[PDB]
Enzyme design. Structure first.
Site, PDB file in Angstrom:
ATOM      1  N   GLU A 168      26.931  57.523  35.276  1.00 38.98           N
ATOM      2  CA  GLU A 168      27.233  58.911  34.891  1.00 38.98           C
ATOM      3  C   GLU A 168      28.383  59.480  35.720  1.00 38.98           C
ATOM      4  O   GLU A 168      29.211  60.251  35.236  1.00 38.98           O
ATOM      5  CB  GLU A 168      26.003  59.811  35.074  1.00 38.98           C
ATOM      6  CG  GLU A 168      24.797  59.513  34.162  1.00 38.98           C
ATOM      7  CD  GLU A 168      25.159  59.374  32.688  1.00 38.98           C
ATOM      8  OE1 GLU A 168      26.164  59.986  32.251  1.00 38.98           O
ATOM      9  OE2 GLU A 168      24.425  58.667  31.951  1.00 38.98           O
ATOM     10  N   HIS A 177      33.056  54.040  27.851  1.00 38.53           N
ATOM     11  CA  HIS A 177      32.320  52.802  27.656  1.00 38.53           C
ATOM     12  C   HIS A 177      33.334  51.774  27.212  1.00 38.53           C
ATOM     13  O   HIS A 177      34.405  52.124  26.738  1.00 38.53           O
ATOM     14  CB  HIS A 177      31.312  52.958  26.536  1.00 38.53           C
ATOM     15  CG  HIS A 177      30.205  53.891  26.864  1.00 38.53           C
ATOM     16  ND1 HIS A 177      29.462  54.519  25.893  1.00 38.53           N
ATOM     17  CD2 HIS A 177      29.681  54.270  28.050  1.00 38.53           C
ATOM     18  CE1 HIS A 177      28.521  55.247  26.469  1.00 38.53           C
ATOM     19  NE2 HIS A 177      28.634  55.111  27.780  1.00 38.53           N
ATOM     20  N   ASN A 337      41.734  29.737  55.796  1.00 37.01           N
ATOM     21  CA  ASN A 337      40.329  30.116  55.674  1.00 37.01           C
ATOM     22  C   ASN A 337      39.384  29.286  56.547  1.00 37.01           C
ATOM     23  O   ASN A 337      39.662  28.138  56.860  1.00 37.01           O
ATOM     24  CB  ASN A 337      39.811  29.925  54.241  1.00 37.01           C
ATOM     25  CG  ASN A 337      40.756  30.404  53.178  1.00 37.01           C
ATOM     26  OD1 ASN A 337      41.290  29.597  52.429  1.00 37.01           O
ATOM     27  ND2 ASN A 337      40.948  31.711  53.076  1.00 37.01           N
ATOM     28  N   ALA A 343      23.764  23.485  55.605  1.00 40.80           N
ATOM     29  CA  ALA A 343      22.973  22.288  55.333  1.00 40.80           C
ATOM     30  C   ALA A 343      23.220  21.839  53.899  1.00 40.80           C
ATOM     31  O   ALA A 343      23.728  22.600  53.096  1.00 40.80           O
ATOM     32  CB  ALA A 343      21.484  22.585  55.549  1.00 40.80           C
ATOM     33  N   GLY A 350      39.938  23.511  50.562  1.00 40.39           N
ATOM     34  CA  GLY A 350      40.699  24.475  51.335  1.00 40.39           C
ATOM     35  C   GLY A 350      41.795  25.261  50.642  1.00 40.39           C
ATOM     36  O   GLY A 350      41.859  26.457  50.813  1.00 40.39           O
TER      37      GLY A 350
HETATM   38 CA   LIG Z   1      43.350  27.928  52.168  1.00 40.49          CA
HETATM   39 CA   LIG Z   2      26.693  20.453  54.424  1.00 38.57          CA
HETATM   40 CA   LIG Z   3      44.712  23.796  53.187  1.00 39.32          CA
HETATM   41 CA   LIG Z   4      25.312  24.065  51.809  1.00 35.08          CA
HETATM   42 ZN   LIG Z   5      27.479  56.143  29.273  1.00 35.72          ZN
END
Ligand SMILES: [Ca+2]
Ligand SMILES: [Ca+2]
Ligand SMILES: [Ca+2]
Ligand SMILES: [Ca+2]
Ligand SMILES: [Zn+2]
Ligand SMILES: [Ca+2]
Ligand SMILES: [Ca+2]
Ligand SMILES: [Ca+2]
Ligand SMILES: [Ca+2]
Length: 456
Positions: A168, A177, A337, A343, A350
């Site tokens: 709302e 919508h 990254n 586990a 990568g």
């Molecule tokens: Ca990367």
């Molecule tokens: Ca692993």
């Molecule tokens: Ca890389």
């Molecule tokens: Ca995992």
């Molecule tokens: Zn709505």
């Protein structure tokens, strides 16, 4: 051809692709295309004082406004403390992504507009409703409460009572919508018109294949989703001041938002990540189910035993990801990254830039799709490589042609060198894909790497 490991990664990165194709017989729309669709009415608030932001005030009505009885809504009642608490949380999530602010108080002189919240008891009024910012009742939203309809009485993270508030408020902000829409998803104008992409939709995620819950149970996003975010930013501009420093989402969350917090392996997360800068992490270490985490901007992830329930907003860069104890897939982006498998048997891709990869326990596979992925000047590092258990997959580069393991480059394409430095426990992999007599691909590891641990 390539290995199954690479194929699983390529499939998941394209699994939610949008645009230029038919889905369910309907055109697939991109996030940009949807942002336009949800704002097709032309209605919005205005920066009347020109300060570069939309500053609005709101009041929880304590008494029926003039002319109230002519609405046919029955008995009027003030929002309870629960509702006020949840409404504030809903307003906040909108304020996080777009340059809009909401301050409790009466209509003031320098405001760009005013909002009101209240309840009614006459079912004829519908479950709830709101008005567009260009109407004579701009800013108003009303919620039904009676014996036969009680969802608005106990709004809370994850339930429809809370998404209703968020929905709302969406309307009062100028969002429509996904379509004009007895109506069903069949009548949708585009394919991604489900609650998996926008809280403004009337249809469930089931229509698009995602899975959030089981029958008898309810699961709704408490905050604006991927498309909703794009829609409002297109209207009022993106708020880059929100969480501009290092942020963790999911388990051990530092985002301070109920809907971005996981404290149990049973939690059902359904959110779209909006972040302003810094080194960020998606921590899903607490789940035991196989997961698929994609750090690409605007992409979808399958988190906590669910599918397509988590995503990153367009224009956002998240740097790290932590899998759970199940066999997961992790896909980075062009930034450096830190990818943690946890586990189980995980597949970790990568991407571009020097990456830090952690397999965890279990047999893990570090996948490389291009030479530019791990270069000598920007090589990835596998901090926990376990020879004879883990593997380094180059199958997408060599296309199964194999490598020629030698001690020194001879100037032939495909020459590869695996070295180990028993003093620093450091290992490495070099290869001359181009055949220029020098290395054009490097992968460093903490732990001896052998000739057999490489798949190519
Ligand atoms: Ca990367
Ligand atoms: Ca692993
Ligand atoms: Ca890389
Ligand atoms: Ca995992
Ligand atoms: Zn709505
Ligand atoms: Ca203003
Ligand atoms: Ca951040
Ligand atoms: Ca970031
Ligand atoms: Ca491992």
């Amino acid at each position: 051809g390539t290995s199954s490991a690479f194929t699983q990664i390529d499939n998941f990165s394209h699994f939610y692709d949008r645009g230029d194709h038919l889905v369910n017989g309907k055109p697939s729309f991109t996030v940009d295309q949807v942002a336009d669709q949800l704002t097709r009415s032309g209605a919005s608030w205005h920066d009347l004082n020109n300060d570069g932001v939309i500053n609005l005030t709101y009041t929880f009505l304590t008494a029926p406004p003039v002319g109230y009885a002519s609405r046919g809504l029955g008995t009027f009642s003030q929002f309870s403390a629960l509702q006020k608490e949840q409404a504030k949380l809903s307003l906040e999530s909108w304020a996080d992504v777009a340059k809009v602010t909401f301050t409790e108080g009466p209509a003031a002189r320098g405001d760009d507009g005013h909002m009101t919240f209240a309840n009614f008891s006459a079912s004829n009024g519908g479950a709830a409703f709101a008005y567009l910012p260009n109407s004579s009742r701009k800013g108003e939203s009303w919620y039904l409460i009676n014996k036969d309809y009680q969802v608005n009485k106990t709004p809370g993270e994850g339930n429809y009572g809370r998404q209703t508030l968020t929905h709302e408020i969406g309307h009062t902000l100028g969002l429509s919508h996904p379509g004009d829409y007895n109506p069903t998803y069949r009548d949708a104008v585009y394919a991604e018109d489900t609650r998996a992409y926008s809280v403004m939709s009337y249809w469930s995620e089931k229509n698009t294949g995602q899975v959030f819950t089981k029958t008898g149970e309810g699961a709704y996003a408490s905050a604006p989703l991927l498309d909703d975010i794009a829609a409002v930013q297109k209207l009022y501009g993106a708020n880059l001041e929100t969480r501009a420093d290092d942020t963790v989402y999911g388990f051990n969350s530092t985002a301070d938002r109920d809907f971005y917090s996981a404290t149990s392996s049973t939690d059902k997360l359904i959110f779209s990540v909006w972040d302003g800068g810094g080194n960020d992490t998606l921590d899903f270490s607490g789940f035991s189910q196989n997961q698929k985490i994609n750090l690409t901007a605007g992409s979808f992830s399958d988190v906590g035993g669910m599918t397509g329930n988590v995503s990153i907003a367009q224009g956002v860069t998240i740097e790290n990801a932590i899998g759970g104890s199940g066999n997961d897939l992790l896909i980075g982006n062009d930034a450096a990254n830190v990818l943690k498998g946890g586990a189980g048997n995980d597949i970790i891709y990568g991407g571009g830039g020097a990456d830090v990869l952690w397999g965890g326990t279990g047999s893990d596979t570090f996948v490389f799709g291009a030479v530019s992925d791990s270069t000598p000047k920007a090589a990835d590092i596998i901090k926990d490589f376990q020879s004879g258990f883990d593997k380094i997959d180059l199958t997408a580069i060599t296309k199964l042609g194999g490598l020629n393991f030698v001690d020194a480059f001879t100037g032939h394409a495909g020459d590869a060198i695996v070295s180990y430095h028993q003093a620093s426990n450091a290992g490495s992999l070099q290869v001359d894909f181009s055949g220029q007599g020098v290395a054009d691909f490097l992968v460093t590891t903490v732990g001896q790497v052998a000739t057999y641990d490489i798949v190519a």
